[PDB]
Design a protein around this motif. Structure first.
Motif, PDB file in Angstrom:
ATOM      1  N   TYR A 194       0.835  -1.213   0.000  1.00 13.71           N
ATOM      2  CA  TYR A 194       0.000   0.000   0.000  1.00 13.71           C
ATOM      3  C   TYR A 194       0.869   1.262   0.000  1.00 13.71           C
ATOM      4  O   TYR A 194       0.354   2.377   0.093  1.00 13.71           O
ATOM      5  CB  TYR A 194      -0.894   0.061   1.240  1.00 13.71           C
ATOM      6  CG  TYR A 194      -2.194  -0.691   1.167  1.00 13.71           C
ATOM      7  CD1 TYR A 194      -2.434  -1.645   0.178  1.00 13.71           C
ATOM      8  CD2 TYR A 194      -3.161  -0.496   2.142  1.00 13.71           C
ATOM      9  CE1 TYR A 194      -3.615  -2.391   0.175  1.00 13.71           C
ATOM     10  CE2 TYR A 194      -4.331  -1.226   2.157  1.00 13.71           C
ATOM     11  CZ  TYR A 194      -4.558  -2.174   1.181  1.00 13.71           C
ATOM     12  OH  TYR A 194      -5.713  -2.921   1.249  1.00 13.71           O
ATOM     13  N   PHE A 195       2.184   1.075  -0.075  1.00 17.32           N
ATOM     14  CA  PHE A 195       3.133   2.178  -0.095  1.00 17.32           C
ATOM     15  C   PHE A 195       4.477   1.587  -0.530  1.00 17.32           C
ATOM     16  O   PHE A 195       5.425   1.542   0.256  1.00 17.32           O
ATOM     17  CB  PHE A 195       3.256   2.789   1.306  1.00 17.32           C
ATOM     18  CG  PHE A 195       3.765   4.214   1.321  1.00 17.32           C
ATOM     19  CD1 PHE A 195       2.925   5.277   0.981  1.00 17.32           C
ATOM     20  CD2 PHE A 195       5.076   4.497   1.694  1.00 17.32           C
ATOM     21  CE1 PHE A 195       3.389   6.606   1.019  1.00 17.32           C
ATOM     22  CE2 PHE A 195       5.548   5.814   1.732  1.00 17.32           C
ATOM     23  CZ  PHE A 195       4.705   6.868   1.397  1.00 17.32           C
ATOM     24  N   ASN A 196       4.551   1.112  -1.772  1.00 20.83           N
ATOM     25  CA  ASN A 196       5.787   0.519  -2.282  1.00 20.83           C
ATOM     26  C   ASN A 196       6.642   1.590  -2.904  1.00 20.83           C
ATOM     27  O   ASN A 196       6.684   1.724  -4.126  1.00 20.83           O
ATOM     28  CB  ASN A 196       5.496  -0.558  -3.336  1.00 20.83           C
ATOM     29  CG  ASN A 196       4.778  -0.010  -4.573  1.00 20.83           C
ATOM     30  OD1 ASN A 196       3.562   0.192  -4.568  1.00 20.83           O
ATOM     31  ND2 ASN A 196       5.536   0.229  -5.637  1.00 20.83           N
ATOM     32  N   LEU A 200      11.601   6.094  -4.498  1.00 16.77           N
ATOM     33  CA  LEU A 200      12.775   6.037  -3.631  1.00 16.77           C
ATOM     34  C   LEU A 200      13.608   4.801  -3.918  1.00 16.77           C
ATOM     35  O   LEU A 200      14.823   4.896  -4.079  1.00 16.77           O
ATOM     36  CB  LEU A 200      12.354   6.035  -2.170  1.00 16.77           C
ATOM     37  CG  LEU A 200      13.466   6.285  -1.164  1.00 16.77           C
ATOM     38  CD1 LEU A 200      13.995   7.686  -1.344  1.00 16.77           C
ATOM     39  CD2 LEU A 200      12.927   6.105   0.235  1.00 16.77           C
ATOM     40  N   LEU A 201      12.951   3.645  -3.986  1.00 14.06           N
ATOM     41  CA  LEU A 201      13.629   2.377  -4.269  1.00 14.06           C
ATOM     42  C   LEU A 201      14.527   2.493  -5.483  1.00 14.06           C
ATOM     43  O   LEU A 201      15.709   2.158  -5.424  1.00 14.06           O
ATOM     44  CB  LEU A 201      12.611   1.263  -4.514  1.00 14.06           C
ATOM     45  CG  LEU A 201      13.174  -0.065  -5.038  1.00 14.06           C
ATOM     46  CD1 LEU A 201      14.324  -0.534  -4.165  1.00 14.06           C
ATOM     47  CD2 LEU A 201      12.073  -1.107  -5.059  1.00 14.06           C
ATOM     48  N   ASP A 202      13.950   2.955  -6.590  1.00 17.41           N
ATOM     49  CA  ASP A 202      14.707   3.139  -7.826  1.00 17.41           C
ATOM     50  C   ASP A 202      15.910   4.016  -7.554  1.00 17.41           C
ATOM     51  O   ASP A 202      17.034   3.685  -7.943  1.00 17.41           O
ATOM     52  CB  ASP A 202      13.860   3.808  -8.910  1.00 17.41           C
ATOM     53  CG  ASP A 202      13.061   2.816  -9.715  1.00 17.41           C
ATOM     54  OD1 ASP A 202      13.556   1.680  -9.890  1.00 17.41           O
ATOM     55  OD2 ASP A 202      11.959   3.178 -10.184  1.00 17.41           O
ATOM     56  N   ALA A 213      12.813  -2.468   4.129  1.00 15.87           N
ATOM     57  CA  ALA A 213      11.438  -2.132   4.461  1.00 15.87           C
ATOM     58  C   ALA A 213      11.016  -2.517   5.866  1.00 15.87           C
ATOM     59  O   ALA A 213      11.344  -3.602   6.355  1.00 15.87           O
ATOM     60  CB  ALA A 213      10.491  -2.790   3.462  1.00 15.87           C
ATOM     61  N   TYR A 214      10.281  -1.611   6.506  1.00 15.12           N
ATOM     62  CA  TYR A 214       9.737  -1.853   7.837  1.00 15.12           C
ATOM     63  C   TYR A 214       8.236  -1.576   7.787  1.00 15.12           C
ATOM     64  O   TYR A 214       7.776  -0.838   6.912  1.00 15.12           O
ATOM     65  CB  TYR A 214      10.427  -0.982   8.891  1.00 15.12           C
ATOM     66  CG  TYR A 214      10.123   0.499   8.869  1.00 15.12           C
ATOM     67  CD1 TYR A 214      11.133   1.422   8.598  1.00 15.12           C
ATOM     68  CD2 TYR A 214       8.871   0.984   9.247  1.00 15.12           C
ATOM     69  CE1 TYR A 214      10.916   2.785   8.720  1.00 15.12           C
ATOM     70  CE2 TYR A 214       8.641   2.352   9.374  1.00 15.12           C
ATOM     71  CZ  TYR A 214       9.675   3.249   9.115  1.00 15.12           C
ATOM     72  OH  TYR A 214       9.497   4.611   9.279  1.00 15.12           O
ATOM     73  N   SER A 215       7.479  -2.160   8.720  1.00 13.49           N
ATOM     74  CA  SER A 215       6.018  -2.016   8.734  1.00 13.49           C
ATOM     75  C   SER A 215       5.568  -2.680   7.442  1.00 13.49           C
ATOM     76  O   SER A 215       4.516  -2.353   6.884  1.00 13.49           O
ATOM     77  CB  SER A 215       5.578  -0.537   8.737  1.00 13.49           C
ATOM     78  OG  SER A 215       5.703   0.074  10.019  1.00 13.49           O
ATOM     79  N   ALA A 216       6.397  -3.612   6.975  1.00 16.33           N
ATOM     80  CA  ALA A 216       6.154  -4.340   5.739  1.00 16.33           C
ATOM     81  C   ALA A 216       4.882  -5.167   5.790  1.00 16.33           C
ATOM     82  O   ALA A 216       4.392  -5.622   4.756  1.00 16.33           O
ATOM     83  CB  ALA A 216       7.340  -5.225   5.427  1.00 16.33           C
ATOM     84  N   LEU A 217       4.352  -5.362   6.993  1.00 13.80           N
ATOM     85  CA  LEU A 217       3.128  -6.133   7.167  1.00 13.80           C
ATOM     86  C   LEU A 217       1.988  -5.263   7.665  1.00 13.80           C
ATOM     87  O   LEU A 217       0.997  -5.775   8.193  1.00 13.80           O
ATOM     88  CB  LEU A 217       3.355  -7.280   8.151  1.00 13.80           C
ATOM     89  CG  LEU A 217       4.335  -8.364   7.717  1.00 13.80           C
ATOM     90  CD1 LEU A 217       4.476  -9.361   8.836  1.00 13.80           C
ATOM     91  CD2 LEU A 217       3.843  -9.057   6.467  1.00 13.80           C
ATOM     92  N   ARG A 299      -1.009   2.983  -2.858  1.00 10.18           N
ATOM     93  CA  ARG A 299      -1.867   4.057  -2.379  1.00 10.18           C
ATOM     94  C   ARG A 299      -0.918   4.977  -1.634  1.00 10.18           C
ATOM     95  O   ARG A 299       0.281   4.714  -1.574  1.00 10.18           O
ATOM     96  CB  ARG A 299      -2.919   3.484  -1.435  1.00 10.18           C
ATOM     97  CG  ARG A 299      -3.501   2.199  -1.982  1.00 10.18           C
ATOM     98  CD  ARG A 299      -4.461   1.522  -1.043  1.00 10.18           C
ATOM     99  NE  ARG A 299      -4.885   0.251  -1.624  1.00 10.18           N
ATOM    100  CZ  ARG A 299      -5.907  -0.481  -1.190  1.00 10.18           C
ATOM    101  NH1 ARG A 299      -6.635  -0.072  -0.154  1.00 10.18           N
ATOM    102  NH2 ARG A 299      -6.189  -1.633  -1.791  1.00 10.18           N
ATOM    103  N   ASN A 300      -1.416   6.064  -1.075  1.00  7.23           N
ATOM    104  CA  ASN A 300      -0.502   6.930  -0.362  1.00  7.23           C
ATOM    105  C   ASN A 300      -0.715   6.706   1.118  1.00  7.23           C
ATOM    106  O   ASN A 300      -0.785   7.660   1.899  1.00  7.23           O
ATOM    107  CB  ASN A 300      -0.747   8.391  -0.720  1.00  7.23           C
ATOM    108  CG  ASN A 300       0.511   9.224  -0.596  1.00  7.23           C
ATOM    109  OD1 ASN A 300       1.450   9.059  -1.372  1.00  7.23           O
ATOM    110  ND2 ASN A 300       0.545  10.113   0.391  1.00  7.23           N
ATOM    111  N   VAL A 301      -0.808   5.435   1.501  1.00  8.60           N
ATOM    112  CA  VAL A 301      -1.039   5.080   2.897  1.00  8.60           C
ATOM    113  C   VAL A 301       0.230   4.867   3.720  1.00  8.60           C
ATOM    114  O   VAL A 301       0.730   3.747   3.830  1.00  8.60           O
ATOM    115  CB  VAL A 301      -1.923   3.810   3.017  1.00  8.60           C
ATOM    116  CG1 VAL A 301      -2.247   3.532   4.494  1.00  8.60           C
ATOM    117  CG2 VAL A 301      -3.210   3.990   2.201  1.00  8.60           C
ATOM    118  N   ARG A 302       0.728   5.960   4.301  1.00  8.92           N
ATOM    119  CA  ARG A 302       1.919   5.931   5.137  1.00  8.92           C
ATOM    120  C   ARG A 302       1.468   5.738   6.581  1.00  8.92           C
ATOM    121  O   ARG A 302       0.807   6.603   7.150  1.00  8.92           O
ATOM    122  CB  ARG A 302       2.700   7.242   5.010  1.00  8.92           C
ATOM    123  CG  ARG A 302       3.924   7.310   5.911  1.00  8.92           C
ATOM    124  CD  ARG A 302       4.509   8.692   5.953  1.00  8.92           C
ATOM    125  NE  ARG A 302       5.142   9.044   4.689  1.00  8.92           N
ATOM    126  CZ  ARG A 302       6.379   8.700   4.345  1.00  8.92           C
ATOM    127  NH1 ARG A 302       7.125   7.992   5.185  1.00  8.92           N
ATOM    128  NH2 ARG A 302       6.859   9.059   3.160  1.00  8.92           N
TER     129      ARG A 302
END
Ligand SMILES: NC(=O)c1ccc[n+]([C@@H]2O[C@H](COP(=O)([O-])OP(=O)(O)OC[C@H]3O[C@@H](n4cnc5c(N)ncnc54)[C@H](OP(=O)(O)O)[C@@H]3O)[C@@H](O)[C@H]2O)c1
Ligand SMILES: C[C@H](CCC(=O)O)[C@H]1CC[C@H]2[C@@H]3[C@@H](O)C[C@@H]4C[C@H](O)CC[C@]4(C)[C@H]3CC[C@]12C
Length: 320
Positions: A194-196, A200-202, A213-217, A299-302
């Motif tokens: 929901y926030f991949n 930034l990754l690239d 990644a944290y809060s990965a779940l 989504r933009n769910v931070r």
């Protein structure tokens, strides 16, 4: 042994599946000790903790107990610690790392990070406050902070250094620092379907910086820190569907998703059954259609906005 690792830009190797150890105070610290042991046993060779987690005593005691056991060798445990914002000032880094090492009873950390970009006043209080509830921020050249981190890496107290909660601008700052000796080996940021953080990754990939990644779940969703109204990640429809098709679980797909993305994932769990279950990411694979299916859940769910630190020019979350 033999576990999946990735070559960090500094020559070192980091296991792709890391075990998170933070938990709410409502939970006794003893639980952290027993949990880590269960993780080591299950297959976790990467352990993520911090000073602010106030659990390094237990977490260390654990990993130290499994080495004494003969269950594992130190070179098979990749322990991460993080420098807390009340010690960003240069002359305060090494002492901070040394304090942790002392509570852990280890001679070095495999990875040491700058936990959060915004600084706070030095002192015991991890989150200092004015007599008016005001957070007492402080201003420190993070590049100066990063210079002390480099000296720690050289002193052999830290095998690899890196950052967390750094955004593009901040990451660049360190990268383009005059006389940089070690570019951050990684940038640990929140990251789930929901926030991949593709953007930034690239970026990270392009600089050979591993994104952890944290809060990965979906995160612990602790009341003050995470908005209860946010959607429950592991309840997502397409993640549960794919869970079924694969005869696994939505959590395992959130984890496996990350892995194939070239990301290193952290999964925290004190429940034994679940701890052992997470080590299954290595048991199956996702096909391009699914690979894309999960990309679509963006989504933009931070979850963690840590906006109580919203003030300063270094608050990380208001750019990409
Ligand atoms: N640098 C930073 O700023 C930062 C910030 C936040 C977190 N972290 C790190 O990342 C780690 C991840 O922790 P998190 O709270 O953010 O979120 P998380 O890893 O997404 O886990 C949240 C919860 O998911 C549950 N869980 C684990 N495996 C499961 C499974 N197979 N099926 C169903 N539920 C499962 C857990 O409950 P149970 O424990 O009950 O199983 C857990 O409390 C932390 O421990 C920490 O080390 C770093
Ligand atoms: C900075 C991190 C968030 C990111 C991460 O987990 O990496 C948060 C997560 C939980 C927070 C602690 C909180 O549970 C207990 C206590 C509350 C007091 O009001 C202030 C002190 C305490 C010890 C908080 C410190 C900040 C913590 C460690």
């Amino acid at each position: 042994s033999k576990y999946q690792c990735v070559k960090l830009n500094d020559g070192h190797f980091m296991p792709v599946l890391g075990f998170g150890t933070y938990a709410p105070a409502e939970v006794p610290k003893s639980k952290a000790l027993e949990a880590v042991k269960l993780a080591i046993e299950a297959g976790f060779h990467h352990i993520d903790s911090a000073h602010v987690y106030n659990n390094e005593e237990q977490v260390g005691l654990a990993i130290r107990s499994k080495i004494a056991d003969g269950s594992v060798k130190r070179e098979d445990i990749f322990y991460t610690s993080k420098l807390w914002s009340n010690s960003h000032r240069p002359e305060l880094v090494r002492p901070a790392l040394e304090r942790s090492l002392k509570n852990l009873q280890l001679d070095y950390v495999d990875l040491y990070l700058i936990h959060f970009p915004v600084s706070v006043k030095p002192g015991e209080e991890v989150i200092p406050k004015d007599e008016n509830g005001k957070i007492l921020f402080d201003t420190v050249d993070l590049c100066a902070t990063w210079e002390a981190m480099e000296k720690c890496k050289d002193a052999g107290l830290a095998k690899s250094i890196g950052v967390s909660n750094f955004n593009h601008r901040l990451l660049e700052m360190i990268l383009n620092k005059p006389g940089l000796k070690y570019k951050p080996v990684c940038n640990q940021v929140e990251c789930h379907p929901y926030f991949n953080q593709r953007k930034l990754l690239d970026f990270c990939k392009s600089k050979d910086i591993v994104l952890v990644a944290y809060s990965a779940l979906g995160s612990h969703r602790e009341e003050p820190w995470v908005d209860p109204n946010s959607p429950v990640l592991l309840e997502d429809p397409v993640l549960c569907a794919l869970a079924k098709k694969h005869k696994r679980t939505p959590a395992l797909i959130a984890l496996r998703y990350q892995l194939q993305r070239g990301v290193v994932v952290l999964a925290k769990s004190y429940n034994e059954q679940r701890i052992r279950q997470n080590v299954q990411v290595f048991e199956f694979q996702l096909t391009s259609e699914e690979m894309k299916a999960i990309d679509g859940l963006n989504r933009n769910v931070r979850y963690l906005t840590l906006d109580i630190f919203a003030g300063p020019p270094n608050y990380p979350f208001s750019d990409e």
